[PDB]
Enzyme design. Sequence first.
Site, short mmCIF file in Angstrom:
data_model
loop_
_atom_site.label_atom_id
_atom_site.label_comp_id
_atom_site.label_asym_id
_atom_site.label_seq_id
_atom_site.Cartn_x
_atom_site.Cartn_y
_atom_site.Cartn_z
N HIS A 106 45.91 1.52 -67.53
CA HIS A 106 46.54 1.92 -68.97
C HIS A 106 46.37 2.16 -70.33
O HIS A 106 44.48 1.52 -70.59
CB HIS A 106 47.61 0.86 -69.37
CG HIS A 106 48.88 0.46 -67.52
ND1 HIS A 106 49.82 1.55 -68.24
CD2 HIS A 106 48.49 -0.91 -67.12
CE1 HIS A 106 50.74 0.38 -67.04
NE2 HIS A 106 50.16 0.27 -66.48
N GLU A 109 51.70 -2.77 -58.34
CA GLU A 109 52.89 -3.07 -59.08
C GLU A 109 53.47 -1.54 -59.51
O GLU A 109 52.96 -0.90 -59.32
CB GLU A 109 52.17 -3.83 -60.64
CG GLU A 109 53.47 -4.48 -62.12
CD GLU A 109 53.00 -5.16 -62.76
OE1 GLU A 109 52.12 -5.38 -62.65
OE2 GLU A 109 54.00 -5.30 -63.93
N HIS A 166 45.36 -9.33 -62.68
CA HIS A 166 46.53 -10.07 -62.36
C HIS A 166 47.39 -10.82 -61.82
O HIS A 166 48.26 -12.07 -61.52
CB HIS A 166 47.16 -10.05 -63.84
CG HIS A 166 48.65 -8.80 -64.15
ND1 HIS A 166 49.88 -9.21 -63.61
CD2 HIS A 166 48.74 -8.10 -63.61
CE1 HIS A 166 50.26 -7.75 -62.94
NE2 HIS A 166 49.14 -6.90 -64.00
N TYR A 185 48.34 -6.23 -74.71
CA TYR A 185 47.96 -6.95 -73.57
C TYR A 185 47.30 -7.94 -73.12
O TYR A 185 48.16 -8.70 -72.19
CB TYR A 185 47.60 -5.68 -73.63
CG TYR A 185 46.81 -5.50 -71.79
CD1 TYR A 185 48.96 -4.69 -71.02
CD2 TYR A 185 46.41 -5.36 -70.60
CE1 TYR A 185 48.83 -4.53 -69.77
CE2 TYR A 185 46.86 -5.82 -69.85
CZ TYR A 185 47.16 -5.43 -68.91
OH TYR A 185 47.51 -5.11 -67.91
N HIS A 235 58.12 -4.97 -67.71
CA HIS A 235 58.40 -6.33 -67.56
C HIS A 235 59.93 -7.07 -67.88
O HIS A 235 60.18 -8.12 -68.28
CB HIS A 235 57.41 -7.56 -67.98
CG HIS A 235 55.83 -6.96 -67.10
ND1 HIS A 235 55.08 -7.78 -67.75
CD2 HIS A 235 55.93 -6.48 -66.28
CE1 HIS A 235 54.56 -7.12 -67.30
NE2 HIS A 235 54.15 -6.50 -66.20
N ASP A 262 54.15 0.79 -61.70
CA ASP A 262 53.60 1.03 -62.59
C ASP A 262 52.31 1.52 -62.11
O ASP A 262 52.06 3.04 -62.96
CB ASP A 262 53.30 0.74 -64.16
CG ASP A 262 52.92 -0.01 -64.31
OD1 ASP A 262 52.25 -1.26 -62.76
OD2 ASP A 262 52.47 -0.65 -65.26
N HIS A 300 46.36 -2.11 -57.55
CA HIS A 300 47.24 -2.37 -58.13
C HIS A 300 48.93 -2.38 -57.19
O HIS A 300 49.11 -0.77 -57.73
CB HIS A 300 46.54 -3.09 -58.67
CG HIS A 300 47.95 -4.24 -60.04
ND1 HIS A 300 48.43 -5.48 -58.76
CD2 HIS A 300 48.89 -3.76 -60.87
CE1 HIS A 300 49.29 -5.59 -59.70
NE2 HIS A 300 49.46 -5.18 -60.54
N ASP A 304 44.77 -2.17 -64.22
CA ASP A 304 45.05 -3.43 -65.34
C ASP A 304 44.28 -3.83 -65.78
O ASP A 304 44.17 -3.44 -67.14
CB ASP A 304 46.37 -4.31 -64.91
CG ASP A 304 47.48 -3.66 -64.60
OD1 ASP A 304 48.07 -3.17 -64.95
OD2 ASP A 304 48.20 -4.33 -63.84
#
Lengths: 401, 401
Positions: free
Chosen positions: A227, A81, A147, A194, A23, A83, A79, A166
């Site tokens: 992750h 995002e 999130h 985290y 981030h 990554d 998700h 996540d």
Amino acid sequence: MSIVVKNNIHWVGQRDWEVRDFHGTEYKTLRGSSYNSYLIREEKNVLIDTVKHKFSREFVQNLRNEIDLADIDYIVINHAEEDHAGALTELMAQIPDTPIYCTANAIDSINGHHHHPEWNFNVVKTGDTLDIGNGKQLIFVETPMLHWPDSMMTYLTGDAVLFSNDAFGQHYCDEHLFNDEVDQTELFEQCQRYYANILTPFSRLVTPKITEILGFNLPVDMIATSHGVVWRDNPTQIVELYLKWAADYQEDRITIFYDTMSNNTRMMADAIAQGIAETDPRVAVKIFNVARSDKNEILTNVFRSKGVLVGTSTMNNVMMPKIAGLVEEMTGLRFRNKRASAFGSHGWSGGAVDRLSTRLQDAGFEMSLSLKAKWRPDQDALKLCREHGREIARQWALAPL
Amino acid sequence: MSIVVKNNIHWVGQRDWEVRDFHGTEYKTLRGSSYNSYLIREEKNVLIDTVKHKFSREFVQNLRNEIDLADIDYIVINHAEEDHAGALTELMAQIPDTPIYCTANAIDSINGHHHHPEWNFNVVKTGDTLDIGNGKQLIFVETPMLHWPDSMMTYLTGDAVLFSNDAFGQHYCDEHLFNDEVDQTELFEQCQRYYANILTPFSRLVTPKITEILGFNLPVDMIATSHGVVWRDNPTQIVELYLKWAADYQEDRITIFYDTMSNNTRMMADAIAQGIAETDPRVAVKIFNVARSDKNEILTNVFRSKGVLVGTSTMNNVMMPKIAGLVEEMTGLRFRNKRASAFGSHGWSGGAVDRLSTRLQDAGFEMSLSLKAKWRPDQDALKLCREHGREIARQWALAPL
Ligand SMILES: Cc1cc2nc3c(=O)[nH]c(=O)nc-3n(C[C@H](O)[C@H](O)[C@H](O)COP(=O)(O)O)c2cc1C
Ligand SMILES: Cc1cc2nc3c(=O)[nH]c(=O)nc-3n(C[C@H](O)[C@H](O)[C@H](O)COP(=O)(O)O)c2cc1C
Ligand SMILES: [Fe+3]
Ligand SMILES: [Fe+3]
Ligand SMILES: [Fe+3]
Ligand SMILES: [Fe+3]
Ligand SMILES: [O]
Ligand SMILES: [O]
């Protein structure tokens, strides 16, 4: 190679030993991370998530070694995002007709990054199913704002594997895939790190969502996150941690952090801590100079703390910028049921302590009285600082005495 | 050894090649600094300022090599910040009866750090004199809030040397003492860097004070500051620079800085700059990522700029902390006659750009319209960003066309 997770489930992700910044530079990954992608091979072949765009060339090539790309039937994006959906454009360039299963919000986020609205999206919502053959099926569960608005989980029946993306994950890189194969301490540290830095502002949503999922009565043998490790040995231990962490978590602990220009505020901070420790032996105390410390370690301690003391000197009638920056971030994380006290040294007119005290209140902290001192604290001033810690320790006591 | 400045004036200070951090970590000294102390030996012996507490042992010992400490008649403290009055306690421990000449505010600041009120202080105000023999005398000039309440200058008649302490000084370390013996470019850079980051909020006081001093009609052969070179060759060149810098200084220049998590805001910043450059070729454009750049270099450019564009993504409904930190510091520096525009990318609800736009306005910037984009800007969105730069370039033009 890939790694067998369970039966026909293969891990086709990417370990990232080098990565130190997430981030931007807002999340320091001191133990690297991993980007977990999964390939399920039954009657249908299903790819769950991809990896960071950085490793797109490796991801697609490694995927080719495991399976012909044309044989991939469905792609699931939990998700979008970067990554997890970063290698999507590279992959879809080879198999453009392949359907993508994701939430309605995910279409906006996927297209927002990749600019390929022509891809074949399939909107899924909670309860929707996808048969993959051999008596097995995928079950989708929407988890908005956990999130991201686009966030969801995917459950595989029979094998009883929850692809939580996540959720319940952590930035921890290891050659071993399973939670029972890694260092438990390093694992817990990264898990708590985290949650504290990412999932704290969504804590009010965590418990009802977990309660909702538990109502589905779906057996869980493994939890495959996006992750870090795959939870296979007592996999719900991370779920119970999330339940505890979400309930406005706090320990008998006080975090002190500050910034200083000539160490006057530092002297105050140390005296405050002394006052606390000699008043309440139960309280754990941590002190950080924000200019010289890990920002995320500070935030993790704040998360664990029943209250915080924040210090700043007065610089050009305002507070020191790193303190202002940190308080802003705390204003986003929305810590709950925590108390705070502002302190610091000044030269003449001051004003930074009152300014800071107000912003902590804006961040959601219940404010106690502030502590101010002029220039370098002498023995008399240090007594007042030590007494301030006594005042805090008695006020913030979880139990009498 | 010491170094002869002029006649019986000896430099007895300390060069600091290693130092990289001042005021905590708020001022990066990339070219080190020096702490200039001066010993005048006429009929009376006068020490002007000391050095950083760090080098107290060396300072006193080096001073012993130049003179018997008992032979020191007067000590002049122009400014009681730790980098000039730091070795005072160590020195006064050897010569406690030695009188200290300083402002009334200096007694508060000296005692505030050293806790030795029993020292023999002599309050001086503007116009006060101190004869040192041989037809020479010291003349004191109060300079409150330049940059401290305790700040003053000391003028030596005959030799015509102005001991200006912090004023007209800079953090630049060199074996050569005089301004005409060093690199002029590196000298100018550090001088402007110093003013921009330290003296900007007191600019309204600079011109009247300089005007007041010029009214005294005191000849100036040399200006001996407390940091960096001694101005001997056209010494008033730094004074004229201060006059220009104080008058709400700005060049035809625009500074763009931002923080980003996935480079979406960075893409906007680059497109904005392109729009500006292709609209007004006169404008100099600088772009900085605040997480990856020198903070003081950013502030120096802001100081030189007619206007700024500040970028941030939305993180937990608020702005990125390093941006919040930087804006807070700018709120202290009080830049004048400058314009600003907030921009940035968001995922869903956003809000950080409006939040930032308000805080820039609070910092004293005249605000233009904000620029917002969702996720990663496509070709259409980049056109809007490029057009925004055109809008800014035309609005902020110093001259038509
Ligand atoms: C660059 C700078 C700016 C300052 N601005 C103020 C100010 O605006 N108001 C004030 O009362 N003191 C001001 N001071 C004095 C400091 O607040 C004072 O030295 C304080 O006791 C030092 O705190 P610290 O050593 O914990 O950083 C300033 C000091 C510096 C170096
Ligand atoms: C940790 C995190 C928090 C976020 N919070 C918000 C938010 O509160 N509101 C919003 O609209 N978008 C939010 N987003 C989405 C980003 O604003 C979006 O990805 C943006 O376009 C990225 O900007 P950047 O790449 O320039 O940093 C968040 C993203 C991350 C990673
Ligand atoms: Fe994510
Ligand atoms: Fe992730
Ligand atoms: Fe100073
Ligand atoms: Fe100084
Ligand atoms: O993520
Ligand atoms: O200083």
